[PDB]
Symmetry: D2
Subunit: 264 residues, 4 copies
Amino acid sequence: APLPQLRAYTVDASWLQPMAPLQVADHTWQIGTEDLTALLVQTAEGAVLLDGGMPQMAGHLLDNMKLRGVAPQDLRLILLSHAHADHAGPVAELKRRTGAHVAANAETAVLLARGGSNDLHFGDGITYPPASADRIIMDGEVVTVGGIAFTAHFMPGHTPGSTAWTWTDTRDGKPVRIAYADSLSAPGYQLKGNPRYPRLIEDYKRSFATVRALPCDLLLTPHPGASNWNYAVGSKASAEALTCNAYADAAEKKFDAQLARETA
Amino acid sequence: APLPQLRAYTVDASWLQPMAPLQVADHTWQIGTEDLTALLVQTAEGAVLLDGGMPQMAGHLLDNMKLRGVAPQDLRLILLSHAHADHAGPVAELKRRTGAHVAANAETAVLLARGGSNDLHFGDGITYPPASADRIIMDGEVVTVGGIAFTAHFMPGHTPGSTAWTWTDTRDGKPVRIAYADSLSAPGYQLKGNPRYPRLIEDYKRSFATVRALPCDLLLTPHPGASNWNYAVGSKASAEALTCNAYADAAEKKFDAQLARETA
Amino acid sequence: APLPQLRAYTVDASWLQPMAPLQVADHTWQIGTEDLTALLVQTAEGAVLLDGGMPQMAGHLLDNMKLRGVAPQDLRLILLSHAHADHAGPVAELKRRTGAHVAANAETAVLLARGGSNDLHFGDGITYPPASADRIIMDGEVVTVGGIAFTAHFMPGHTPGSTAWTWTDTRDGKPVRIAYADSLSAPGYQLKGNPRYPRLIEDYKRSFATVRALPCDLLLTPHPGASNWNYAVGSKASAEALTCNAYADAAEKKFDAQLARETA
Amino acid sequence: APLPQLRAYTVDASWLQPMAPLQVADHTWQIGTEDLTALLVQTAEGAVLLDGGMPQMAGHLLDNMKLRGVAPQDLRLILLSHAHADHAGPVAELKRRTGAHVAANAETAVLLARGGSNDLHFGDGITYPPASADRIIMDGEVVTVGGIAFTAHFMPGHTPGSTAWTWTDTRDGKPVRIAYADSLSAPGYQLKGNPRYPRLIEDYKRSFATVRALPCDLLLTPHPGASNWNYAVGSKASAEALTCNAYADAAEKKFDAQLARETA
Ligand SMILES: CO[C@@]1(NC(=O)[C@@H](C)C(=O)O)C(=O)N2C(C(=O)O)=C(C)CO[C@@H]21
Ligand SMILES: CO[C@@]1(NC(=O)[C@@H](C)C(=O)O)C(=O)N2C(C(=O)O)=C(C)CO[C@@H]21
Ligand SMILES: CO[C@@]1(NC(=O)[C@@H](C)C(=O)O)C(=O)N2C(C(=O)O)=C(C)CO[C@@H]21
Ligand SMILES: CO[C@@]1(NC(=O)[C@@H](C)C(=O)O)C(=O)N2C(C(=O)O)=C(C)CO[C@@H]21
Ligand SMILES: [Zn+2]
Ligand SMILES: [Zn+2]
Ligand SMILES: [Zn+2]
Ligand SMILES: [Zn+2]
Ligand SMILES: [Zn+2]
Ligand SMILES: [Zn+2]
Ligand SMILES: [Zn+2]
Ligand SMILES: [Zn+2]
């Protein structure tokens, strides 16, 4: 009886369904797929990319950046929510083909440095090509590119380096405060007494309060369904979107019920 | 039409067929599978592991080390031939569970650091968990562990960091010079005018002469069939084994014919 | 007028005054200098080193380990308080000459990876040879070596990766709870509105409460004077030592006065 | 008697004497100091920097790039000769403040990754802030930026990753072939039987032949005096400059005499 074969990381087909650039604000564009968020922010001095999706999406992101008139050498910075393969997949290839830098916190940098291997909950099952972080950022730090200020807010939980990014854009000249909050889920995580993450419950709870207090007029999440975004219906995508309170309060109820069912 | 799914790195079943420790010399043991070489060298001050095989072989290697009376903390050093997933797969997990160090040259270290991603010929198709090299070694350098001296011989070709290791063991008190030479194949490689490896032909040719001149009374290769080793027949495994000249001369004939067919 | 010359990191002479192993508990030994703490813990399966001091102390640490009958290959693990040159200096050389692994959190790992360069407060003025962390640890995680359990407690402040280590030893068979807390000082730090560390005050305050609640019957600090340890007087070294409450309460009073004087 | 203090890396004052941009060709500019070469190549799609000099020269390089009308975000690539502190010093700071990428071979990347520590000949005496290489290049590989092609030529000797860069510029429309060859010196190196570099003599000899055959109409070196460049006299700087043959033949005579005196 031979040893088992390696198994690839397969996802839903909608996660890999490419879409054209859907506009969020005057400078913010969704250029990922129907079920994976990849945000582009075009400024006067360059573009900024927030997350990238699956590893095989690198070419699709570049095609959509070309549609927005953004050349590869115009991408200045890559920001991340958390360093899992379904969000930070193409980061390594994007750095090679765009000449961009990656800014992330220490926890996301070390997870990105080993390509998602030795995950606290997933082990080596979800692995992507590794990449290095060029700039380490702290909680509440401000990253400015082309006059647009990106503020990081640590929200540990899904990964130890989970980060929410908030910035202020315009919509026909009216200022809108966009908050890109990371996921607050724990799919199959051992919450109680996890040796690889002893203070996991304290971090999740403290992150729920963090998401509630985010300066936010419009919320987006790495998975659009988590905040009731529907990238497929085009104009009416943000119709039934959730608030920061509604998103954090719904996520905490799921966390407590899962925590209660774990004690069984 | 969605983007294609990720595909895993599947191999022949014999590459994953575990085997018990087959003895090579007084201190050298094969503890891998039937078609993947993993050499253990037990010394008075600790053990040395040469290659590890597929990524899912980490547990099998530890079980065989236990059969030889080698505890995890007794593995002192990990040496490599080249940093591909079918040879350096479990290196990252082995470092975590054994407290061992990895010695490799600059070219193998950087390929091991990115887990085989961005391969010169394979791209991101064959990816394994990344690991870091603790000690960088040069061509002709001597690594000593427990009185046994391991000499490295650079043989660039299959990978830029392909390394042959030679050491002198005993067999019932009689000194035997064991040479562990890396593969000299180029499966699907573009040999002529490869932009990622311009001087590839010069390196292959120079490596053929290197393998011929290795101090060698017994030759082993990462794939046992490359030197006509048959780990399955136990005692008669080294019966029809090849010499250093026979192995290099057969590999060069295949390289030239492939090079001639490439010009077509 | 030429550009200014590089200036080395010079310290007090007592920081570099070697001392013989002074015993703390049945298994805990101070093997550093008179004004720099380097703790050795000898277990049945190997030794553990906590901090190392200045970069030029690597040879002195090895000599003292030899006096305790600890061979270089017997050092299994290196633990750190924070990755500054006066505490993590010889870590890179120690890893080369002992075959030991380093366990630290993400923030200490990335600072250790760049050798103290690009410090949040010191820039590139205090730089030491870089080293890599082999195992990343989380807050409250337990590291066990030879039956002795080391519990990490994150106390961000002096550096973002400042860590206190607590373990339970014996003293003539009587269990003693030793806590090795990191420094709580801010020599020349901008506390209010520091762009490289926006939430610095929140981390310092939260760390003061962390140090107070440490399970501790005997406290040691990277600088022995910070807890009124006097390694020079031998037996009477722990005579006037401070408690966890006394150490945290004295450090907070200095932090608030410095914070009040900063607002001037 | 306390342990000795750390000593900084002090150099000649002329190595730190800033100079204004002296023009080499239509697109090539020397923007370093009087005795340290730092070459800037302005193209239509961005600038390229070859070497940077001492670590404290980062601000001077940026000032000279501003004089050439090159903004920090316009520096696309950093190329190196070898990763010593007097040539790759400011690379880490330049990457932070310019958003540029670094391309170097495996041997230079690993030396740059540890900031010059654990040098084969210098140990930890010459240490600079570490930086990471974004793109690994092979011997004879071509790097193109803005239509200007940079060809790498490995010349191991001074360091294992010593690289000569050759490109073709214009001078009033007339094509000039510029070769930037690395140093061929061995100041205090043990040449014969060096355990850290066993095949050092073979690499030096093979590199002498490499420098002779470089396509070169104008030669520059990291230290301008090595090729009889005098950056101080402005226009007449390249007056008494050496050829590729003259530079390699003079360096080999010094190597053989030093090798003969070493055998004494
Ligand atoms: C590693 O990627 C994830 N997990 C998986 O794909 C497998 C392992 C699974 O358990 O379903 C992960 O985390 N995601 C999230 C998230 O909320 O971030 C959700 C909702 C589920 O999908 C991705
Ligand atoms: C990356 O692993 C290898 N390649 C593959 O598995 C695929 C990609 C394939 O082309 O067959 C690779 O190289 N090997 C060698 C070797 O000689 O080293 C041989 C003989 C073929 O198998 C492994
Ligand atoms: C980087 O090393 C330190 N700082 C210096 O040496 C210079 C920069 C200085 O400002 O005096 C640092 O932090 N230490 C601590 C500590 O409490 O950790 C104390 C008390 C002061 O000494 C070391
Ligand atoms: C590490 O920097 C160097 N060495 C020193 O500065 C000290 C250590 C010294 O031995 O003089 C080094 O190599 N250089 C070269 C070169 O040719 O590259 C020359 C000519 C001498 O200066 C620099
Ligand atoms: Zn995820
Ligand atoms: Zn996800
Ligand atoms: Zn291979
Ligand atoms: Zn193979
Ligand atoms: Zn400090
Ligand atoms: Zn200190
Ligand atoms: Zn040099
Ligand atoms: Zn030099």
